[PDB]
Design a protein around this ligand. Structure first.
Ligand SMILES: CCCCCCCCCCCCCCCCCC(=O)OC[C@H](COP(=O)([O-])OCC(O)COP(=O)([O-])OC[C@@H](COC(=O)CCCCCCCCCCCCCCCCC)OC(=O)CCCCCCCCCCCCCCCCC)OC(=O)CCCCCCCCCCCCCCCCC
Ligand code: BCL
Ligand code: BCL
Ligand code: BCL
Ligand code: BCL
Ligand SMILES: CC[C@H]1c2cc3[nH]c4c(c3C)C(=O)[C@H](C(=O)OC)c4c3nc(cc4[nH]c(cc(n2)[C@@H]1C)c(C(C)=O)c4C)[C@@H](C)[C@@H]3CCC(=O)OC/C=C(\C)CCC[C@H](C)CCC[C@H](C)CCCC(C)C
Ligand SMILES: CC[C@H]1c2cc3[nH]c4c(c3C)C(=O)[C@H](C(=O)OC)c4c3nc(cc4[nH]c(cc(n2)[C@@H]1C)c(C(C)=O)c4C)[C@@H](C)[C@@H]3CCC(=O)OC/C=C(\C)CCC[C@H](C)CCC[C@H](C)CCCC(C)C
Ligand SMILES: COC1=C(OC)C(=O)C(C/C=C(\C)CC/C=C(\C)CC/C=C(\C)CC/C=C(\C)CC/C=C(\C)CC/C=C(\C)CC/C=C(\C)CC/C=C(\C)CC/C=C(\C)CCC=C(C)C)=C(C)C1=O
Ligand SMILES: [Cl-]
Ligand SMILES: [Fe+2]
Lengths: 237, 281, 301
């Protein structure tokens, strides 16, 4: 029967489709490793995908995946048990070491570029015509931590020009320096900006950026990682 | 085993119950208190299904069917073989689904991310609870819930539906369907767009988000944006399930007739109700 | 409580983005439209510009004619009475020619001929639009994933209104142009073929339709959960994996035992959705042409 041949054929096609999808989804992180970093014996029934290349715009080079996988950065963690399956505890300051919920990835120390080769993210004071068009404007507002103490004041807004959206709030600290705060980790209010992830004294520990007009992917990851990590490492305060 | 970048994330903490007593993984799976709880409920639920199968006299997954108590049992407990199994299995499932959600929450805490996922999963649980608990309770009997059988639960959908004529006329059902269709449309478009940007024409450099925007702008005159599309996808699928639970929680509780009759608040309207002509005149 | 990033807290507005040029013929790109603060709370506020080429205009022209043919017919059914028009709007229906006419085009206007005319226009409108989704991607140097995914939806539509009717021998088998009437056609179609629940392709189609809501809920929530690390910027995460892509992957690996990649999740997405209409088209195409009763068919196989 045709209907019978059809459905039978579809299930064959589907098994082949799933096989393809799973291997496509192994272009990052595989092969699997033992907790000591060495390759793991069991890699599953699905084989490693064959290399594919991405030619990045603006002479940024080419990415090949799968490929030599390495965390080009030290990991301040230690095994908690002999066997596998147990937590690895931070050897130092998780927040400062960038581990656990405060982890960051060694991305390119370059700014994400827009389609025309310009910095994607930029402080409003450097983006002609950008302004708050709705909602409360956090600029000039005090930034308060989970300790209820004021850590500083909002001196600017870093916007994703292409998407026209607020991504970072630049906060000036007592020492007079500034730090970027992810927009999705703050709560803008009528009189202040509340940050539940950090305590006022921890804002200084937020990794700093080199240029005052741009931010690299590497820095964005350190900033975001550090801030999100406060939810677990700055909660006691 | 671990993904090459996973180790730095497998730190202690994030639990809601049991401190570090269950703070560990089994293979890739995180356990946690809710993990052992899920295993418990799931194991007991599966064992009871197997028991119901021994009673049914079949091992075929196509025939095994666990029916709820008869309507005569109202909301009371029933004997294992006559619906009790369905009642206990329903309790185990609810415990398993809820525990699964709380386990996700712990996972969210350990990774320091938002709780959007378990929050979203809760809508599905509420939809399940609507058909198996809320509606049955409001109608006065567990027997109004669906049976646990691959094909028998479809017959249930059919019988329940036709009990009200053509279910297509349930206005809340229309809305849910529109969200379901619009969702699949949006998922297809979003997957396509990203892929078309990351895997451009041959002989071209990987596209940027701007190309995605320009594409949808040229095509339909508006780009919701990278953030917007994920927000929309979540909203479409959640709204679909919401209107699903809604179209069922009102059927047989505040509505009892053929759903097509509902549309009279528009047709039989006093004035034009009698104007000659059209389809209803 | 915490912020959820479902709606923006503070909207920002700057110069309108005219878009990438690439090989797009700017001669057909309109000017920029106004900003919608209302839309700005959920997504972007910029409206337009839009592109209109020869194919788009043709598509718009045909589409409007399709709408005009159905509308004019509705007025006729309403007796040109505005009141009757608004009350029976959803009850009006432009039905296909009766069976007697087979696949003939000789059906009288008031008895199916107008349906054929409306279908001609819809056929041109859809395919022209399909060519357009292909051309818009080509001009920007993008892959043709959108045109291919669109072909899947078009496939179900082609089967419902043209392919199956032709193999069945009459236009009477096609779907009528009416809100409630096409709903009744759908219900009748199932009763006539022995319960569509037993059409395995319908079952698969449901699994993917349900699976699409499951997958987008999973994906939408996941990206929002890691938006605090710039997760929504998926293309860059693909080019240079960040903690956002890693945390998202680990959340799922720890939850269900396996995960995706920032790029691979979109292949899962495009296929989950595409399979909906793909399997659905097959199931409908096989109905009445090869299988008359699905329930019965299923008991024997
Ligand atoms: C009877 C029932 C049988 C059911 C059969 C159904 C068959 C469905 C047809 C699928 C067509 C495949 C499309 C394809 O190859 O895309 C390239 C695509 C590469 O993606 P890419 O790198 O992003 O695009 C670059 C390309 O170079 C190309 O770049 P591009 O931009 O020019 O094009 C985009 C590309 C990418 O497109 C896609 O990823 C989505 C494809 C959706 C196409 C849907 C077409 C629907 C057609 C409707 C007609 C229905 C008629 C059915 C009768 O296509 O490869 C895949 O998607 C993998 C296909 C999975 C194949 C599974 C094989 C299973 C066979 C089982 C073997 C036994 C196992 C045991
Ligand atoms: C797939 C099974 C049936 C069918 C079953 C249903 C059911 C059941 C419902 C609809 C509903 C709708 N159908 Mg239908 N529909 C069919 C074929 C079609 C075709 C066609 C062949 O091209 C069209 C144009 C429509 C169009 C429509 C819309 C008016 C409405 C909302 C859908 C939606 O969210 O879209 C996505 C939105 C955008 C793209 C914008 N249907 C086939 C024949 N349709 C819903 C409604 O409210 O109807 C009154 C509804 O409940
Ligand atoms: C003849 C039948 C009637 C009809 C009768 C009914 C009835 C009766 C119902 C629907 C319902 C629905 N109908 Mg209808 N329906 C008809 C025709 C249609 C048509 C159409 C093209 O014709 C469409 C598109 C729909 C669409 C729909 C959906 C909106 C809705 C189902 C989604 C849902 O509730 O998800 C909700 C999601 C869930 C219930 C899933 C729960 C998930 C749980 C939490 C997780 C499970 C975990 C698992 C056990 C673990 C597995 C382990 C494995 C190893 C992985 N109907 C016809 C006219 N319809 C249902 C509804 O609204 O329900 C609320 C419903 O009850
Ligand atoms: C929501 C409206 C109705 C309903 C209407 C329909 C209709 C109509 C159809 C299905 C179909 C299915 N339904 Mg149902 N279904 C309902 C509620 C449920 C529940 C529940 C706990 O709520 C479950 C687990 C299922 C499960 C299923 C799957 C077996 C099948 C494929 C759907 C799919 O892939 O979705 C997307 C989900 C995924 C892709 C995730 C993977 C889910 C796997 C496939 C589900 C495993 C179910 C499993 C066998 C239960 C035993 C596990 C325990 C170990 C014992 N339904 C309610 C009552 N269902 C289709 C079919 O062919 O049925 C025969 C079908 O046509
Ligand atoms: C009594 C009714 C029968 C039944 C009869 C049918 C029939 C008959 C069909 C389905 C089909 C479907 N059914 Mg059913 N179905 C039943 C019960 C159910 C239940 C349930 C009880 O829970 C569920 C979940 C479903 C689910 C489904 C879907 C998986 C599937 C539709 C795919 C889709 O997205 O189409 C929506 C998408 C399209 C129609 C694509 C068309 C797109 C065109 C190209 C766009 C035109 C746009 C236009 C030009 C104008 C608008 C543009 C504006 C300018 C914006 N059915 C009951 C048992 N069902 C369809 C299928 O494939 O079945 C195998 C189908 O034909
Ligand atoms: C609210 C919108 C949509 C949605 C979202 C959603 N689903 C989710 C999530 C989210 C956000 C998860 O995080 C979670 C997940 O982990 O995904 C991989 C999940 C999930 N959605 C699932 C299924 C599912 N979701 C569905 C639907 C939807 N999910 C929506 C469309 C459907 C249907 C029918 O449409 C199904 C079948 C699971 C794969 C997974 C949750 C896994 C889980 O809870 O595991 C714990 C339990 C077990 C391993 C087994 C329990 C054993 C029971 C004791 C017995 C079974 C009895 C059962 C009631 C009978 C079923 C018989 C049928 C034939 C009727
Ligand atoms: C995998 C199948 C799903 C899907 C995919 C899909 N639809 C698509 C596409 C894709 C990939 C497009 O590229 C195309 C589009 O341009 O989107 C904005 C489209 C589209 N899907 C549309 C509608 C639509 N899709 C539907 C369904 C679905 N589309 C599926 C769920 C439905 C229903 C009934 O559920 C409808 C009503 C149109 C908005 C648009 C095609 C526009 C068109 O043909 O215009 C011609 C007419 C005029 C200009 C007249 C005015
Ligand atoms: C950018 O981000 C993202 C990721 O990472 C990069 C992801 O992986 C995912 C996760 C998604 C996938 C891996 C795609 C495949 C998943 C589905 C099609 C959904 C259906 C799922 C299943 C059938 C698996 C069910 C398995 C279970 C419940 C575990 C069983 C075992 C026990 C021991 C209990 C998403 C959404 C994502 O957005
Ligand atoms: Cl065009
Ligand atoms: Fe995405």
């Amino acid at each position: 029967d045709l209907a019978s041949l059809a459905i039978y054929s579809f299930w064959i096609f589907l098994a082949g489709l799933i096989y393809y999808l799973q291997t496509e989804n192994m272009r990052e992180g595989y092969p699997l490793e033992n907790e000591d970093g060495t390759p793991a014996a069991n890699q599953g029934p699905f084989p490693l995908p064959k290399p594919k290349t991405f030619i990045l715009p603006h002479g940024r080079g080419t990415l090949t995946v799968p490929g030599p996988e390495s965390e080009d950065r030290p990991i301040a963690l230690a095994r908690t048990a002999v066997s596998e399956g147990f937590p690895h505890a931070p050897t130092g300051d998780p927040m400062k070491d960038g581990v656990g919920p405060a982890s960051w990835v060694a991305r390119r120390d370059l700014p994400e570029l827009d389609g025309h080769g310009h910095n994607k993210i930029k402080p409003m004071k450097a983006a002609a015509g950008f302004h708050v068009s709705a909602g409360k404007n956090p600029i000039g507002l005090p930034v308060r931590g989970c300790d209820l103490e004021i850590a500083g004041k909002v001196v600017d807004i870093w916007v994703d020009i292409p998407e026209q959206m607020a991504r970072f709030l630049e906060v000036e600290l007592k020492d007079g320096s500034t730090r970027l705060l992810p927009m999705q980790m703050v709560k803008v209010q009528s009189n202040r900006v509340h940050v539940n992830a950090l305590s006022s004294d921890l804002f200084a520990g937020i990794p700093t950026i080199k240029s005052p007009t741009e931010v690299t992917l590497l820095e964005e990851d350190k900033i975001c990682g550090y801030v999100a990590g406060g939810l677990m490492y700055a909660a006691p305060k | 085993a671990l993904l090459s970048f996973e180790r730095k994330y497998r730190v202690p903490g994030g639990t809601l119950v049991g401190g570090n007593l269950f703070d560990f993984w089994v293979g890739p799976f995180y356990v946690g208190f809710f993990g052992v709880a899920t295993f418990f409920f799931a194991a007991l639920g599966i064992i009871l299904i197997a028991w119901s199968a021994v009673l049914q006299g079949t091992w075929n997954p196509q025939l095994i069917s666990v029916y709820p108590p008869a309507l005569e049992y109202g909301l009371g407990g029933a004997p294992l073989a006559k619906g009790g199994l369905w009642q206990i299995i329903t309790i185990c499932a609810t415990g398993a689904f809820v525990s699964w959600a709380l386990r996700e929450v712990e996972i969210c805490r350990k990774l320091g991310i938002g709780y959007h996922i378990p929050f979203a999963f809760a809508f599905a649980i509420l939809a399940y609870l609507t058909l198996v608990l809320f509606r049955p309770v409001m109608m006065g009997a567990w027997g109004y819930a669906f049976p646990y059988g691959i094909w028998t639960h479809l017959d249930w959908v059919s019988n329940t539906g036709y009990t009200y004529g053509n279910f297509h006329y349930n206005p809340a059902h229309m809305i849910a369907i529109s969200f379901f269709f619009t969702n699949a449309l949006a998922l297809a478009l979003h997957g396509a767009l990203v892929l078309s940007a990351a895997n451009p024409e041959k002989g071209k450099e990987m596209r940027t988000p701007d190309h995605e925007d320009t594409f949808f702008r040229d095509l339909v005159g508006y780009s919701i944006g990278t953030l917007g599309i994920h927000r929309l996808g979540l909203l479409l699928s959640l709204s679909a399930v919401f209107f699903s639970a809604l179209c069922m929680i009102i059927t047989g509780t505040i509505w009892f007739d053929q759903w097509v009759d509902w549309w009279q608040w528009w047709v039989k309207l006093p004035w034009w109700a009698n104007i000659p002509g059209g389809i209803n005149g | 409580a915490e912020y959820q990033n479902i709606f923006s807290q503070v909207q920002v507005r700057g110069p309108a983005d005219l878009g990438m040029t690439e090989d797009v013929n700017l001669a057909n790109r309109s000017g920029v439209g106004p900003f919608s603060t209302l839309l700005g709370w959920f997504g972007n506020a910029q409206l337009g510009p839009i592109y209109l080429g020869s194919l788009g205009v043709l598509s718009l022209f045909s589409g409007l004619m399709w709408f005009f043919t159905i509308g004019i017919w509705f007025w006729y059914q309403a007796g040109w009475n505005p009141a009757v028009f608004l009350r029976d709007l959803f009850f009006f229906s432009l039905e296909p020619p009766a069976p007697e006419y087979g696949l003939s085009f000789a059906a009288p206007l008031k008895e199916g001929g107008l349906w054929l005319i409306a279908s001609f226009f819809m056929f041109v409108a859809v395919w022209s639009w399909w060519g357009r989704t292909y051309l818009r991607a080509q001009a920007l140097g993008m892959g043709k994933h959108t045109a291919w995914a669109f072909l899947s939806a078009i496939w179900l539509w082609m089967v419902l209104g043209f392919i199956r009717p032709i193999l069945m021998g009459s236009w009477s088998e096609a779907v009528p142009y009416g809100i409630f009437s096409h709903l009744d056609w759908t219900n009748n179609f199932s009763l006539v073929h022995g319960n569509l629940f037993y059409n395995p392709f319908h079952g698969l189609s449901i699994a993917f339709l349900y699976g699409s809501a499951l997958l987008f809920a999973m994906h939408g929530a996941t990206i929002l959960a890691v938006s605090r690390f710039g997760g929504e910027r998926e293309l860059e995460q693909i080019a240079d994996r960040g903690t956002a892509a890693e945390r998202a992957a680990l959340f799922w690996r720890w939850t269900m035992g396996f995960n995706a990649t920032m790029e691979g999740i979109h292949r899962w997405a495009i296929w989950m959705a595409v399979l909906v209409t793909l399997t659905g088209g097959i199931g409908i195409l096989l109905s009445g042409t090869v299988v008359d009763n699905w329930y019965v068919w299923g008991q024997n196989h």
